[PDB]
Amino acid sequence: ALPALIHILQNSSNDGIKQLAGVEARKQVSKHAATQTSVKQSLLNSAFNEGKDAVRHANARVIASIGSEELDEKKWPELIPNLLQAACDSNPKIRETAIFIILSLLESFNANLALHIDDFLNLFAQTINDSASLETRSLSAQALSYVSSLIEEEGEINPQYAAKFASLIPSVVQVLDATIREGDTTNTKLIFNCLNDFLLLDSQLTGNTIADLVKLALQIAVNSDVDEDIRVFAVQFVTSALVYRKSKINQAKLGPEITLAALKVASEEIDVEDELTNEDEENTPALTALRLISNASGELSPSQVGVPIIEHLPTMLSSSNPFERRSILLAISVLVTGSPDYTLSQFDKIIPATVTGLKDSEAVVQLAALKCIVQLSTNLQDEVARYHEQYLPLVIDIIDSAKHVVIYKYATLALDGLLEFIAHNDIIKYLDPLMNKLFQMLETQQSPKLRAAIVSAIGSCAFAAGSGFVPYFKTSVQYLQQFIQNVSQIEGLSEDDIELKALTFENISTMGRAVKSAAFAEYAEPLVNAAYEAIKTDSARLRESGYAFIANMAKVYGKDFAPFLQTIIPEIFKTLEQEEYQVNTGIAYEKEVAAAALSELAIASKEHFLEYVEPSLKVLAEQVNESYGLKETALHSMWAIVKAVLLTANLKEGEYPKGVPSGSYVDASALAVIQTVREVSLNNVIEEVETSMVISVFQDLSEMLRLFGPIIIMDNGDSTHLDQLCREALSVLKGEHACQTIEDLDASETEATLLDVALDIYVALSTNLVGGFAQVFTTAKPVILQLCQSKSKNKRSFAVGALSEIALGMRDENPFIQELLEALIISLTNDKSLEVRCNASYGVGLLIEYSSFDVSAIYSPVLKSLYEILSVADEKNLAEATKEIVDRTFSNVCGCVARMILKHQNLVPLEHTIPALLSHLPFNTAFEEYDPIFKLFLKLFQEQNSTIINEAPKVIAIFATVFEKESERIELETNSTLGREENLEKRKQFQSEEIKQQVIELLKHLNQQFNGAVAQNPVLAQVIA
Amino acid sequence: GGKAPRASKAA
C-alpha cells in the first residue's frame, strides 16, 4: 500500500515529483512484505547517486524513518555500523550523505540510539572538522545537539562523555566562523540553533564556554560588515542567554558589555520614513537590540544595565547623529519596564532628556522621546504626570504641527497617559481647553487608529477630573454614541474598526466612574444593553470591552446592579473556559477583564452573589490548574470572591480580633470558602518555579491578612498552613526557594520585589498576631537582621523597613526590642544610604516607644545621629536620593525625636530640640509622623512648658496648614473619580478622629490664652467654633 | 520595604 510512494521517488522523470513522493513516503512509513529488504537497497543507491541534493535528502529521510521502525528488535543491525563506515570514507560526498542520514536517525529519537553515544562522540569529533565539506561540518554540529540530549537522559552524566562533548564546543564555534566567512547564511542560522541548545545543557557538558559564547555573539552582533540577518541571530542568542543562563553572564560581569553592545547596534541607521508612517521589523539589528536591552533590564541589576545607559545619556543625546539621539531615548523607554525604581531615581536626568527629545528638529528623535514618555507613564504613572506643565505645551504643539501619522498617534498617546494620572486639582486649570482640543481633533482625524488614541485621551480627562467632568458628560456621549452603533454587526469591520468601538465602550464606562450614578442615569439603559451585545459578539476584543464596561458598572451601581447577575455570570463563565490556543491573545485579554468583572460584581452584589460563590470558585480554580496565562489573575479573583463573602458577613476591613484564633471569628460557610482558596494559594507557592506566581500569591495573602486577619491563613488552633506559609517565605529570604534556585549576589528589581513581598508576609502576620507572632518570627529574625547588612541598598532598605513595621505590629508585647533596637541604631548611625537611615529612624522611635527597659545609655548617641541626619538631609534639601526621600527623612526623624521626648522627657534637653522640631514643620509628606508630634504638643502645652509656650505662633501656623490640607482632602474625597482611593490613607493629616478632637480642643484653649490668636486665622476660626 | 514607599483607568 506504501511502497508505491518509493517507486515514484526513484523513477519519476520530472524531478520535483521524486521529491514530492519522498515527503509523503516518510509520513506514511509508520503505518506500512517479505521484500522490505528490496526497498531498503533501492533507497540507499538513490541516496548516494541521485543527482540533486533535494532528492538525495528525500531518499535519506525515508531511510531513517525505516531505521527507527526497523529497530523494534535487532531487525537492521548493520545500518548504524555501515553509516559509521561511510562517514569515514575517502569520498567527501559519501561522507556528507552518511552524516545526513545519521542526523535523520537522531531526529527519530529512537531510544536505541543511546546505545551508541560513544560512537557518535568519536565520529562527530572527526567529521566536525571535515576539511572538504562545510555542509558536513554543519550537519555534525546539528547532530551534536541530539547526542547531548542522549548523554543527559542517562541516570548519571557520564563524566567521560561530557568531557568529550565539551571538547567539541570550540569546534562548533569554528564551524560558525566558517559559515559566516563563506556566506552560507542557511548553515549560519543552523549553527546558531546549536549554540542556543547549549544554553539548556547541564554545566558539565558545556564546560566554562557559555560566557565566551556570549562574548563571541557580541563580536558578531556589533560588526556591521556581517549580514543583517546573521547579526539578528547573534542578538537573539545573547537575549536567549539572559533568559536561560543569567548566572553565567553575572559571573562574567557581562551585563555592561551586553548593554553597551546593544546600545551601539541600536544607534544604527534605520528607515526613517517607514518608522514615521508605517503603523506596526524586529528582525533588523537595531530593533532586535531594543529587545535585548529590555530583557537585560529585566534579568539583571540596574547597576549592570541601567547605569551604563544613564552614563551614556549625555553624550548620545547631544550627538549630531540623530540615530544616536533616537537610540538613547528608546533605550530608556525599554529600560523602564524591568527597572522602574532605578529609572525613577534618574528622573533628574531623564525628564530633561525627554524634553530635549521633543525639541529636536528630527521627527525620528521626536517620535523616540514620545515613546519614552509613553513608556514612563505606563510604568511610573503619577510620577510622570507631575511634570505636565513642561510636557503638555510641548505635546500639544507636536500634535498641531505633526506631519506623520505615527507621531500623531504617539503624541496623542503621550497626552493620554499624562492626563490619566494628573492630580484632580491640576486638571481643572486645563479641562476646558483640553476638552475642546480633543473634540476638535476627533472631528479632523478620520483614521480609526488616530480616533482611538483621541477617545482614550478624552476618557483620561474624565478619569482625572471626576465630578468636574459633568459639564462635558452629555455632549461627549452624544458624540461618542456614533462609534457604538451596530455593535453586533462585526463583519465588514477592520481590526482598527473593532478597537475604536471597544475603546469607546471602555472610556464611556470610565465617565460613569467620574460623574456618578445620578449623572449617568440618562444613558445607563441603552449603554448597558449595548455592552451585553458586545459580550455575545464573536470578537474577543469586543467582548473584553463589554466586560470592562460591566466591571465599571459594578463600581457605579453596587447592589443596584445585582438583578443583572443571572444573565452576566454565564457569559463570564463561557469566556473563562475558552480554549486558549489558535496563543490567542485576544482571548487572554478577554479572560483577564472578564475575571476583573466577575470580581467587581461579587464585591458589589453582596448577599446576591452567594449562590454564585461555589460555581465561581469552581471555574476560577480550574483556570489556575489549566490556564496558560491567567493563573495569577484567576487566583486573585478567588481572593476577591473571599473579600466579597467576608464583607457580606460584615467583617469590616481592619476589624478582626488579634491573635492566633482558637476557633473562628467567621461563620462556618465563610470559613469554608476561605479554606478553599487558602489551600489553592499554598499549592501554587510550594515547589513553584515561576517567581511571578510566588509574588502574586504572597501579595494576595498579605493583602487578605491585613484586611481580615489571621483567619485567612489559620483557624481552629491548627497552624499547618501558617507553618507552610512561613516555611516558604523564609525560603525566599534565604534565596533558597524553587523559584529562586534555577548569597551577596546583585539582584534584579524583580528579584528584590520577591524579597520584599516575602517580608510583607512577616509584616502582616506581626500586626495580626501581636505578641503571638514572636514564635514564628524567631527563624526569620536572624535572616532579616543579616539582610540589613546586604551590599544591596534596596535590600538593606527592605529589611530595615520591614523590621520597623514588625516592631509596630508587636508593640509592647515584643520580646526582642533590645536586640532589634541595637541593630537599627547601628543602621541609623553607620549606614551610607539616606533612605536606609530614613527607615531606620522610624523603627528606632517605635522600638524606644515600646521598650520597657532602661534606654538612658542610648539616648545621647541616638540624638546625635538624629541631628546629623538632619544635617545630611539639610544640604540635600537646599540644592540615588530623591526629594521625596529627603522630605520623608525629616518627617521620620521628627517623629522619632517626638516619640523619645514622649517616652523619657527627662532624658531629652528640650530647649534645643523643640526648635529643631518646629523648623521642619509643617510636613510635606509622611503625615503619619504628625501623630506623635500632635501628642507631644498636647502634653507640652498641658504642662504650660515654657519652650512650647513661647512658640505658640509657629504652632498656630502649623495647625492652619494642617486643617487647610485636611479640608482640601475632604473636597477631593467627594469629587474624585470612583475607585481612585489608592492614597486615601496617605493624605490623611490625623491618624484618628480622637486625636483630631484633642487638637481642636487644644486649639480652643489656645484661643483664650493668647487672646484670640487662633481665630485671627480664617482656617482655624472655622474649626474652632 | 518599610515606611519609604516601594491600579488605574485600565482593567
Numbering used by the authors:
A (entry chain A): 40 to 71, 77 to 324, 330 to 631, 658 to 817, 827 to 963, 968 to 1113
B (entry chain C): 12 to 17, 21 to 25
The authors write:
Kap123, the most abundant karyopherin in budding yeast, functions as a primary transporter for the H3:H4/Asf1 complex, whereas Kap121 acts as a secondary transporter. Kap proteins share the common structural motif of helical tandem HEAT (Huntingtin, elongation factor 3 (EF3), protein phosphatase 2A (PP2A), and the yeast kinase TOR1) repeats with a right-handed superhelical solenoid structure. Here, we report crystal structures of full-length Kluyveromyces lactis (Kl) Kap123 alone and in complex with NLS peptides of H3 and H4. We identify that there are two spatially separated lysine-binding pockets within Kap123 that specifically interact with H3- and H4-NLSs.
To examine how Kap123 recognizes H3-NLS, we determined the full-length Kl Kap123 crystal structure in the presence of a histone H31–28 peptide (1–ARTKQTARKSTGGKA PRKQLASKAARK–28) at 2.7 Å resolution. No major structural change of Kap123 was observed upon the H3 peptide binding with Cα root-mean-square deviations (RMSDs) of 0.4 Å. Although we used the histone H31–28 peptide for crystallization, only residues 12–17 and 21–26 of histone H3 (12-GGKAPR-17 and 21-ASKAAR-26) were clearly visible, indicating that H3 peptide residues 1–11, 18–20 and 27–28 were disordered in the crystal structure and not critical for H3-NLS recognition by Kap123. The determined structure revealed that the H31–28-NLS peptide interacts with Kap123 through two deep lysine-binding pockets separately located at the Kap123 inner concave surface. K14 and K23 of H31–28-NLS independently interact with two distinct and distal lysine-binding pockets, demonstrating that H31-28-NLS recognizes Kap123 in the bipartite binding mode. The first lysine-binding pocket (repeats 20–22) of Kap123 captures K14 of H31–28-NLS through both hydrophobic (Y926) and negatively charged (N980, E1016, and E1017) residues. The first binding pocket only allows small hydrophobic amino acids (Gly or Ala) as neighboring residues (G13 and A15 in H31–28-NLS) by making several backbone contacts. The second lysine-binding pocket (repeats 11–13) of Kap123 recognizes H3 K23 and makes additional backbone interactions with K23 neighboring residues (S22 and A24 of H31–28-NLS) without strong amino acid preference. Notably, the two lysine-binding pockets of Kap123 are distally positioned and the distance between the Cα atoms of two bound lysines (H3 K14 and K23) is 26.6 Å, indicating that more than seven residues are required in between two key lysine residues. This results in –XSH-K-XSH-(X)6 or more-K- as a consensus sequence for Kap123 recognition.
